[PDB]
């Protein structure tokens, strides 16, 4: 089997991407944030505290003939940006882009933090990291990909995120029309439950490539690119007037600037992030100070190849017995 679904930015900054997912019988379609940095599929639901729902589409298990309470199971998750959610669990039929999993754990939110409430366009998350990170207790549950894997034509999914435009998540096949050149594959460590790999270095603009190992995760659920302070300082030093602002919470730059590209290494290959991808616009409405898309990972504890980086590539998440990651230009 295979599946193919379009993913769409939630706003004009590409702060996140939503992909329609069919849950239950008859289908209830919710728009979920596919997150390769977590491993819970959770949704706004009929159980969610009413004051914490503001515009989201909810899953109502009582209207699904295939929904079953997973008795005794609870879940609770906290994300890197400080947001969180928690609730109980149903199993139900879940389909993405024509690919169907029966018995998928669908985590029903009883509580969500303010950032989720305030984002009316995100109806929940679908985690695509390794199932060892799944938070369901006392019986840990598998991700949608893990459940689908054996039925897939090939044990892979791909992320093809757009810059200010729709893109695609495919399951079970590599669309050879979706990228240019060849795909370069690189080793993954699953030790922390992430799609963790090591980039071979970077360049700023038309500058020379610096060979240096940068360990980090491929995380579709993180907006920006978080890298070591040394790397990030070297980037922003090439933008007149750029500075790290404690009050704003990262590097800012004059909105009048033309940003340089940023290149990262994948083995001997190179992925180029155009400067425009690094512009996250005014820090507040009408400001002439703009927020940078490359930020320091210092104090996160891990480097994160978020959407800023991933949207510059066609990315293969290879879930074969020895997982790997592939990157191609597009």
Swiss-Prot record:
It catalyses: Hydrolysis of proteins with specificity similar to that of pepsin A, prefers hydrophobic residues at P1 and P1', but does not cleave 14-Ala-|-Leu-15 in the B chain of insulin or Z-Glu-Tyr. Clots milk. The keyword Hydrolase applies. Residues 17-328 form the Peptidase A1 domain. Disulfide bonds join 255-290. The keyword Disulfide bond applies. One of its GO terms (biological process) is proteolysis. Keywords: Aspartyl protease, Disulfide bond, Hydrolase, Protease, Signal, Zymogen. One of its GO terms (molecular function) is aspartic-type endopeptidase activity. The active site is at 35, 199. Its EC number is 3.4.23.22. Belongs to the peptidase A1 family. This is Endothiapepsin. The lineage of its organism: Eukaryota, Fungi, Dikarya, Ascomycota, Pezizomycotina.
């Amino acid at each position: 089997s295979t599946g193919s679904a379009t993913t769409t930015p939630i706003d004009s900054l590409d702060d996140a991407y939503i992909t329609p997912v069919q849950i239950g019988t008859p289908a209830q379609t919710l728009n979920l944030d596919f997150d390769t940095g977590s491993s819970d599929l959770w949704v706004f639901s009929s159980e969610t505290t009413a004051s914490e729902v503001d515009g989201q589409t909810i899953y109502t298990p009582s209207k699904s003939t295939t929904a079953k309470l997973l008795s005794g199971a609870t879940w609770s998750i906290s994300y890197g940006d400080g947001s969180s959610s928690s609730g109980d669990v149903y199993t139900d039929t879940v389909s993405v882009g024509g690919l169907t999993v029966t018995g998928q754990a669908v985590e029903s939110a009883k509580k969500v933090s303010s950032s989720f409430t305030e984002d009316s366009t995100i109806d929940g998350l679908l985690g695509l990291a390794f199932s060892t990170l799944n938070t369901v207790s006392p019986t840990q549950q598998k991700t949608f990909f893990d459940n689908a894997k054996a039925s897939l034509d090939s044990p892979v999914f791909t992320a093809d995120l757009g810059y200010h435009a729709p893109g695609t998540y495919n399951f079970g096949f590599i669309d050879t029309t979706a990228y240019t050149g060849s795909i370069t594959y690189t080793a993954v460590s699953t030790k922390q439950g992430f799609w963790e790999w090591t980039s071979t270095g970077y360049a700023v603009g038309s500058g020379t490539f610096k060979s240096t190992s940068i360990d980090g995760i491929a995380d579709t659920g993180t907006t920006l690119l978080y890298l070591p302070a040394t790397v990030v300082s070297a980037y922003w030093a090439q933008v007149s007037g750029a500075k790290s602002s404690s009050s704003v919470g990262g590097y800012v730059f004059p909105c009048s600037a033309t940003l340089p590209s940023f290149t990262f290494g994948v083995g001997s290959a190179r992925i180029v992030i155009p400067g425009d991808y690094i512009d996250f616009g005014p820090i507040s409405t009408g400001s002439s100070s703009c927020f940078g898309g490359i930020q320091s990972s210092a104090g996160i504890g891990i480097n994160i190849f978020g959407d800023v980086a991933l949207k510059a590539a066609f990315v293969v998440f290879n879930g074969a017995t020895t997982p790997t990651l592939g990157f191609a230009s597009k």
